[PDB]
Every structure is written in structure tokens, then in C-alpha cells.
From a paper:
Instead, we found that [name] from another fungi [name] (ct) is 62% identical in sequence to thCENP-I, and showed excellent biochemical behavior. Due to the high degree of sequence similarity, we tested whether ctCENP-I could form a hybrid complex with thCENP-H/K for crystallization. It has been shown that the N-terminal region of hsCENP-I is necessary and sufficient for interacting with hsCENP-H/K. We therefore purified the corresponding N-terminal region of ctCENP-I (ctCENP-INT), which indeed formed a stable hybrid complex with the thCENP-H/K proteins. We first determined the structure of ctCENP-INT at 2.3Å with the Single-wavelength Anomalous Dispersion (SAD) method. ctCENP-INT adopts the HEAT repeat fold containing five pairs of helixes α1–α10. A following helix α11 folds back and packs against the HEAT repeat with extensive hydrophobic interactions, which likely contributes to the protein stability. The structure of ctCENP-I is similar to a model of hsCENP-I proposed previously, except that helix α11 packs on the surface of the HEAT repeat in our structure. The structure of ctCENP-INT in the complex is very similar to the apo state.
Author numbering: 8 to 197, 205 to 227
């Protein structure tokens, strides 16, 4: 069922709502209801990540609703992860900062379902260089705290985040990430604890994941 729903949304997303022959709203609600009930398979997650990150004519409310119901029924592939990472930052190809925040939050919430979580370590710089962008900083810090390994904690990165903390006047999410850096190099001098951003989402994701056994 799901592939036909995505088919319809993807074709409607190429057309301004003014010019569509039928409104897309009922198919959005069918998709989001199906996502909530069954989650999405790895192939469907790629298709969904495409309409979430490409520039198209879907409205922001529908895009947020899909993201909030983007429950993986199985695992999350490297291609999906890299689609969301490629959508981060400033650019004519890129989605709103508000959506980027939800993508980053989602990445934290499905971290244990990534097929190769180490792939985030290979794009560490993309994530780290965006810490200036205050609109996504809390979600960046949380994701970076999960991804940071010793090899990422290079002196230039230690200083940039010390400089950013000073210049912003202190920021508890930057302080949290600095404490992760501190775990590796305790000579760094340094209040956010990065708990799960949505325990309800976790419980419902777990219920969907329960069916795999």
C-alpha cells in the first residue's frame, strides 16, 4: 500500500497546490496514518527522505507531519542518513532550518537503528561546521555528542567550540558537547545532559519495532 501513497505525493509535490487537479491533503493523511501504524521500510524511508529534502511544492505543515511520523519499521540505511545530512545548512537546494531541526532530532531518535552508525563519523565536519547556526544548534549538539570519537576531537575543533561558547555568551548545549570533548582531553576547562528528546516517540517506535520479533 505505502508505495502507491508515496507515488501520489511525489507526483503532487512537483506541482504548485494552485495547479493540482485534486488536493493532496487526504493522501498526506493516509500516508501519515499508515506511517504511524506500520512505520516505513528501508526502501520507503529513502523515497520519503527524497520528498522531505528536495525542493518541491509540498507545504511545510505536511512535511513536518511526515517527519514526525517517520517511524522505521526495520533499520535505517546509509543512503537515508546521508540524504538528511546533505540537506543541512544554507543553500537554495536545502529545506527550512525548522525542518532541519526535526531531521537532526530524528537522527538522534533512530541512532540505534542505523545500519552503519559510523557513517556519521565520516561527515563529522559537515555537522560541526554548522554549530554557528543557532536555529539548529541544540539538535546538532545532541547528535554530535552521540557521534564524537577521539579522532574527531582535534585542537582546531576544541578551540572553535571554546570560541563559540565565549562569543555566544555561554550556551548549555555547547557546554554539553564540550563535556564530551572533555571526556577525551580532560585538560579542557568547562549544563545540558541530552536526554531523549521525545519519550512518547521512543515508546511508539519501540512498539513498531517489537513486531519484528
Amino acid at each position: 500500500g505505502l508505495p502507491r501513497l508515496i507515488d501520489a505525493i511525489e507526483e503532487a509535490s512537483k506541482i504548485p497546490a494552485k495547479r493540482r487537479q485534486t488536493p493532496i491533503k487526504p493522501t498526506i493523511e493516509k500516508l501519515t496514518t499508515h506511517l504511524y501504524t506500520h512505520g516505513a521500510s528501508p526502501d520507503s524511508l529513502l523515497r520519503l527522505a527524497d520528498l522531505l529534502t528536495l525542493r518541491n511544492h509540498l507545504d511545510q505543515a505536511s512535511l513536518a507531519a511526515i517527519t514526525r511520523n517517520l517511524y522505521p519499521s526495520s533499520t535505517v540505511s546509509d543512503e537515508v542518513v546521508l540524504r538528511f545530512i546533505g540537506a543541512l545548512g544554507h543553500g537554495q537546494l536545502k529545506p527550512t532550518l525548522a525542518l532541519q531541526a526535526l531531521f537532526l532530532r530524528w537522527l538522534v531518535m533512530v541512532y540505534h537503528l542505523l545500519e552503519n552508525p559510523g557513517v556519521l563519523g565520516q561527515v563529522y565536519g559537515v555537522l560541526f561546521d554548522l554549530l554557528d547556526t543557532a536555529a539548529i544548534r541544540p539538535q546538532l549538539c545532541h547528535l554530535l555528542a552521540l557521534v564524537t570519537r577521539r579522532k574527531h576531537v582535534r585542537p582546531f575543533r576544541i578551540q572553535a567550540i571554546l570560541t563559540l561558547s565565549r562569543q555566544t555568551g555561554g550556551d548549555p548545549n555547547l557546554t554539553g558537547l564540550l563535556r564530551v570533548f572533555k571526556n577525551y582531553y580532560p585538560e579542557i576547562i568547562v549544563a545540558s545532559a541530552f536526554k531523549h528528546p521525545d519519550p512518547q516517540w521512543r515508546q511508539h517506535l519501540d512498539e513498531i519495532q517489537q513486531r519484528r520479533s
